Amino acid sequence: NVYKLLLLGSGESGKSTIFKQIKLLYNTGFGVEELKNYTPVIHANVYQAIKILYEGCLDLQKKDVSGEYTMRRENMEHGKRIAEIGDGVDYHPIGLLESDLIAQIWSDPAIQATYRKANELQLPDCTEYFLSGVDRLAKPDYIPTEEDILHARVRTTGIADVVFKHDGHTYRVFDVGGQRNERRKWLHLFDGVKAVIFCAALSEYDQNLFEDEGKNRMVETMELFESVLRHPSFEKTSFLVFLNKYDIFRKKVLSVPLNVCEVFRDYNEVQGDQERKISHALQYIKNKFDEIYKRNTPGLGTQRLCWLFETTALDPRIMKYTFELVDKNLVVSSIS
Numbered sequence: 001n002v003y004k005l006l007l008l009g010s011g012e013s014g015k016s017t018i019f020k021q022i023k024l025l026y027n028t029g030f031g032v033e034e035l036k037n038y039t040p041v042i043h044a045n046v047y048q049a050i051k052i053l054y055e056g057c058l059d060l061q062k063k064d065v066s067g068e069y070t071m072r073r074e075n076m077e078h079g080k081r082i083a084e085i086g087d088g089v090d091y092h093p094i095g096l097l098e099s100d101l102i103a104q105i106w107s108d109p110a111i112q113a114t115y116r117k118a119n120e121l122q123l124p125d126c127t128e129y130f131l132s133g134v135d136r137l138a139k140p141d142y143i144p145t146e147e148d149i150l151h152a153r154v155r156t157t158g159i160a161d162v163v164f165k166h167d168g169h170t171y172r173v174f175d176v177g178g179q180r181n182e183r184r185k186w187l188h189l190f191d192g193v194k195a196v197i198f199c200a201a202l203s204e205y206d207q208n209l210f211e212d213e214g215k216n217r218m219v220e221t222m223e224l225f226e227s228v229l230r231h232p233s234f235e236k237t238s239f240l241v242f243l244n245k246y247d248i249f250r251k252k253v254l255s256v257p258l259n260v261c262e263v264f265r266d267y268n269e270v271q272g273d274q275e276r277k278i279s280h281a282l283q284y285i286k287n288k289f290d291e292i293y294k295r296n297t298p299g300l301g302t303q304r305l306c307w308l309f310e311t312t313a314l315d316p317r318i319m320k321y322t323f324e325l326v327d328k329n330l331v332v333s334s335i336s
């Protein structure tokens with residue numbers, strides 16, 4: 001008797017990172033042979049970040065010849081060759097000469113100005129983590145760490161599942177892609193679900209979708225949440241909402257106000273120290289998700305539960321705490 005969990009949310013909300021985190025905490029885990037199979041993915045992510053930075057820099061220079069966005073002509077050439085390696089079908093791991101050029105691109109001031117506009121780009125979140133550590137990833141004896149695996153970015157396009165045990169209870173969690181094209185595939189997974197883990201990126205409120213750059217990422221997340229809550233298969237199904245990327249949110253909400261996002265235009269920032277500002281904004285986002293849940297659950301908590309958790313999917317301590325909080329909530333609530 002196996003309780004089925006279903007990871008849902010829009011693209012890059014964090015579902016696969018949570019999926020790996022579950023493998024790390026409740027099973028083994030990785031997996032040195034399978035860790036090495038992530039080297040090509042990590043290299044691909046690096047090549048893709050340089051490509052998007054280099055192309056975005058060139059476009060930002062077209063709009064503005066200040067020129068805050070004009071690269072050193074040397075790094076303009078290096079940026080072109082490195083991006084053409086990524087686009088090639090050949091193979092080409094990142095060796096020492098590659099890492100030296102990538103590092104040199106990443107250090108150009110125009111690239112860092114472009115990187116400060118990552119929200120206007122479609123830049124993988126792991127960009128700064130991997131580019132800063134490009135020399136380590138280029139060594140011939142390099143084995144990815146478990147931290148590397150959690151940062152590595154693979155756009156999910158199939159169904160994956162893993163079973164795990166805690167207490168005497170068996171679980172099977174399913175991972176599926178969240179980009180628009182992959183959502184046809186959700187419908188047949190909707191049966192026999194004991195709980196939906198709905199991932200929602202807190203840090204996305206100043207970004208537009210990869211599938212449609214006219215659509216705010218967070219508006220899409222909230223419409224998507226409402227559309228899942230309104231599906232008949234989930235009428236009496238529990239929702240655990242992971243308000244993920246809390247680490248990124250902490251930095252962003254201090255520098256980009258929430259009102260940049262159309263669903264947060266009524267936000268009124270309080271004054272105080274960094275943590276009262278962070279805390280107040282998070283409570284405000286939580287209330288908004290709560291409102292969507294209440295609007296769509298006539299019998300509220302006697303129909304289905306909806307618990308909200310701020311999370312950082314990369315961080316095992318925060319994840320271990322988050323899952324223990326779930327069990328602590330179930331014990332106090334007398335729910336089985």
Ligand SMILES: Nc1nc2c(ncn2[C@@H]2O[C@H](COP(=O)(O)OP(=O)(O)OP(O)(O)=S)[C@@H](O)[C@H]2O)c(=O)[nH]1
Binds near residue numbers: 015017177244314
């Ligand atoms: N800083 C930070 N990065 C995160 C966090 N969660 C996920 N990421 C990073 O964001 C990237 C995208 O996350 P991912 O798990 O692949 O999203 P997804 O929901 O599975 O995306 P898709 O399969 O529907 S396209 C990954 O590279 C991951 O490392 C987080 O909480 N904080």
Ligand SMILES: [Mg+2]
Binds near residue numbers: 017154
């Ligand atoms: Mg995924």
